[PDB]
Design a protein around this ligand. Structure first.
Ligand code: SF4
Ligand code: SF4
Ligand code: F3S
Ligand SMILES: [Mg+2]
Lengths: 267, 534
């Protein structure tokens, strides 16, 4: 699957919705074909790989044991309740799979709020005991770079990988282990509606003339002021982001946001 | 003689989510099958007690492949519970984002999830690109030249000679495989278009973000309507229209001709993978409270009796747990649903999946593009009839051919083509409505303390329903019954095989170590296990 010239990436899927995998397919300049043919060697990825079953398992083993080394990208939270039973691949628990593979990686990137912080299946009452990668695997010394969001901006994944390949090290990380080059500002301080916020000009409802005129969404629940992400700067799909579509930020790059930021339409 | 014994495929790749397929084969043909979904998250448990307005944000994270669809179903569900009738423009914008979702989803499914079951990418290296270009130009109005395809070949050649096959590592076609039929030139055309589709899908998804903020996981729906006042502007509408036009051209000029050239080469696949019963909910309403106002209409068919389409009665759905990892054995209507996990391991107490087993009047029902297409055809839908007839004529087969893995794959293309054209009709109506001076996109509403609601979406994989019981203004019960749950859930308490299980009986398996024929049928249903289990 790999040896030579392109760096090997092993992409794992735990308890996930595949929205983070889909976000990578939206990669733009570079696009995902350049990424898979030129930049990287994508040596395991259940969504798009040709092999299945035993053949897929063999591809994974050969990638993880390569003397050339591999980078792991991990999507989804790790279910830990009932000894990891709620999530299995090839009849192995995801906790076991990640326990055995991730300490062998040269570097681990937790991609998406589920992998970074536990995510949607970790929201109360967390029936499957879902945990983010670094929480789950603390005891094994795993320290994944956390690229948060639900899903994250794929600009932030490619940027982190490129940095890593260039500099042979993680970029500066915040106290949640997120790169400060992407997560160093609140989405609010970057928001075009900030002048309205400053003037106390809030939309009182989505049907209101104030919402039509683009007034601030804080009274309608916007979590921009407490959320770190680069959404207003980079935007998504080269064209838009939640509050330019008229909807409040729901805080999706923050830990525990399903419980901390709810009800989503209140502040 | 041939192989007898078990085959297990775990993981089934090139699907969403975590699926284990188990089959018993006898003399090279499958005689028994189990569909085992091996991840549970429990979103229905997590929703209990929360604000109904929050449900769509959680349930959208059921799945990021069929992104938006669950936000739409929960919003339709709470809209219904609250009794709000959203403005015409919110219906148009919601419908336009959903049409864009279908085009993105089906294009990615055929190329990036299904086609490696049928295309030997490495054989493309041996192709004659001049011959290949002539074939490509004969099947499409788009002209392709030898140099066009040589560029692809040169790129693939450098990739393969590095020894780092990446996503093609251990592919079932490596070295050759008796169930792979395509000649090198057709493998090269498909491989070129796979690569092309990786960039085209960026545009198809961007179309959703023009109105819907971002893809994946849109953020423009609210109870009562949508939030995106910018979607009214001529600039955003023009941006959407340009991406839609380019996406439609790809469907018409690249995907459907490839689908037809591959189906022609694999016409033996009309003989495997059939099913008996079909359910569909209809989609693209004019009236949010009348399913029969939808461009595709709901319906139910038993035992392929399409002369007797039955009305869809939402009260005849029950979700079984006897062969699932939940407590007990009692089937439940989703307004009385229960989600009480209880794991017994594979086949412990005859249970083998985290999916429930939905049954309609006690029967297992296929849903998805083949149900939507066949039921619409049988209701006299003129656009569906015109393109399925053209497809049947091109392939030289009769309508019976549609009850198969090949037919299901073709139906996915038919509905893509039909929806790609209908998005233009919807866009024009939306434009017309704005031009009449209707600029309203959200209506006011009030939360009742007690209510029941349901929202119905026909998603790219079929009939999706979200069901809420509101108690004290909070979520008392919230149940998702999702298309892959119908199609890929396990047996019920009458031990009836689900559509995927039944469809697998009779599958030939040339090489038990590389059981591509099982993947062909399983992938034809476009499984989504995060969807099915939630
Ligand atoms: S972070 Fe969000 S988008 Fe990504 S796998 Fe989790 S639920 Fe899906
Ligand atoms: S809309 Fe949200 S992010 Fe923008 S100024 Fe208001 S509170 Fe801040
Ligand atoms: S909801 Fe998430 S995508 Fe950005 S605008 Fe808020 S952090
Ligand atoms: Mg359910």
């Amino acid at each position: 699957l790999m040896g030579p010239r392109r760096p090997s990436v092993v992409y794992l899927h735990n308890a996930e919705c595949t929205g983070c995998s889909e976000s990578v397919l939206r990669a733009f300049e570079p696009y995902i074909d350049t990424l898979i043919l030129d930049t990287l060697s994508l040596d395991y990825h259940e969504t798009i790989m040709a092999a299945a079953g035993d053949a897929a398992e063999a591809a994974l083993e050969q990638a993880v044991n390569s003397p050339h080394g591999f980078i792991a990208v991990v999507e989804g939270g790790i279910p830990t309740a009932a000894n990891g039973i709620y999530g299995k691949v090839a009849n192995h628990t995801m906790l076991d799979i990640c326990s055995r593979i991730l300490p062998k990686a040269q570097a681990v990137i937790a991609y998406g709020t589920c992998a970074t912080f536990g995510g949607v299946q970790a929201a109360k009452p967390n029936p499957t005991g879902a945990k983010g990668v670094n929480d789950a695997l603390k005891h094994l010394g795993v320290k994944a770079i956390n690229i948060a969001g639900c899903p994250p901006n794929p600009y932030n994944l490619v940027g982190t990988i490129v940095y890593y390949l260039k500099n042979k090290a993680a970029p500066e990380l915040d106290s949640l282990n997120r790169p400060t080059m992407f997560f160093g500002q609140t989405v609010h301080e970057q928001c075009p509606r900030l002048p309205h916020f400053d003037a106390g000009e809030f939309a009182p409802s989505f049907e209101s003339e104030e919402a039509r005129k683009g007034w601030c969404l804080y009274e309608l629940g916007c979590k921009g002021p407490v959320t770190m992400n680069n959404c207003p700067k980079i935007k998504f799909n080269q064209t838009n982001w939640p509050v330019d579509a008229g909807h409040p930020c729901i805080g999706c790059s923050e830990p525990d946001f399903w419980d901390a930021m709810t009800p989503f339409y209140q502040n | 003689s041939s192989y007898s014994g078990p085959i297990v495929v775990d993981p089934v790749t090139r699907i969403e989510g975590h699926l284990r397929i188990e089959v018993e084969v006898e003399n090279g043909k499958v005689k028994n099958a189990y569909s085992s979904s091996t991840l549970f998250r429990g979103l229905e448990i997590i929703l209990k007690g929360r604000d109904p307005r929050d449900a769509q944000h959680f349930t959208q994270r059921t799945c990021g492949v069929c992104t938006y669809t669950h936000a739409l179903a929960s919003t339709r569900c709470v809209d219904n519970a609250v009794g709000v009738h959203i403005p015409k423009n919110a219906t148009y914008i919601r419908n336009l984002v959903l049409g864009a979702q279908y085009l993105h989803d089906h294009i990615v499914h055929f190329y990036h999830l299904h086609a490696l079951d049928f295309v030997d990418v490495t054989a493309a290296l041996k192709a004659d690109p001049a011959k290949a270009a002539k074939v490509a130009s004969s099947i499409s109005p788009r002209k392709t030249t030898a140099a066009d395809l040589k560029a692809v070949q040169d790129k693939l050649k450098t990739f393969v000679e590095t020894g780092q096959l990446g996503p093609f590592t251990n592919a079932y076609f490596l070295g050759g495989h008796p169930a792979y039929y395509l000649d090198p030139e057709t493998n090269l055309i498909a491989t070129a278009h796979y690569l092309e589709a990786l960039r085209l899908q960026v545009k198809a998804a961007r179309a959703m973000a023009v109105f819907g903020a971002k893809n994946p996981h849109t953020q423009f729906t609210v109870v009562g309507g949508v939030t995106c006042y910018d979607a009214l502007t001529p600039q955003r509408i023009a941006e959407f229209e340009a991406l839609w036009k380019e996406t439609k051209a790809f469907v018409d000029e690249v995907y459907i001709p490839d689908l037809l050239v591959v189906a022609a080469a694999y016409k033996d696949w009309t003989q495997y993978g059939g099913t008996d019963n079909f359910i569909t909910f209809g989609e693209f309403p004019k009236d949010e409270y009348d399913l029969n106002s939808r461009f595709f209409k709901p319906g139910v068919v038993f035992k392929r009796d399409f002369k007797n389409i039955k009305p869809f009665d939402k009260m005849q759905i029950e979700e079984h747990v006897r062969h699932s990892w939940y407590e007990g054995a009692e089937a439940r209507h989703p307004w009385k649903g229960q989600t009480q996990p209880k794991y017994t391991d594979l086949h412990g107490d005859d249970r083998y999946s985290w999916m429930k087993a939905p049954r309609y009047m006690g029967e297992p029902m296929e849903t998805g593009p083949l149900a939507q297409v066949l039921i619409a055809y049988s209701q006299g839908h003129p656009k569906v009839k015109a393109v399925t007839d053209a497809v049947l004529a091109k392939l030289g087969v009769g309508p019976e051919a549609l009850f198969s893995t090949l037919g299901r794959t073709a139906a996915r293309g038919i509905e893509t083509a039909v929806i790609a054209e209908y998005v233009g009709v919807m866009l024009q109506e939306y434009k017309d409505n704005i031009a009449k001076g209707d600029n309203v996109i959200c209506a006011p509403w009030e939360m009742p303390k007690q209510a029941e609601g349901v929202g119905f979406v026909n998603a790219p994989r079929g009939g999706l329903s979200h069901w809420i019981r509101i108690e004290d203004g909070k979520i008392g019960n919230f149940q998702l019954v999702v298309p892959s749950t119908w199609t890929l859930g396990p047996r019920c308490d009458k031990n009836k095989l689900s559509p995927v299980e039944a469809s697998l009986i009779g599958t030939p398996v040339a090489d038990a170590k590389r059981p591509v024929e099982i993947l062909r049928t399983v992938h034809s249903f476009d499984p989504c296990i995060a969807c099915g289990v939630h």
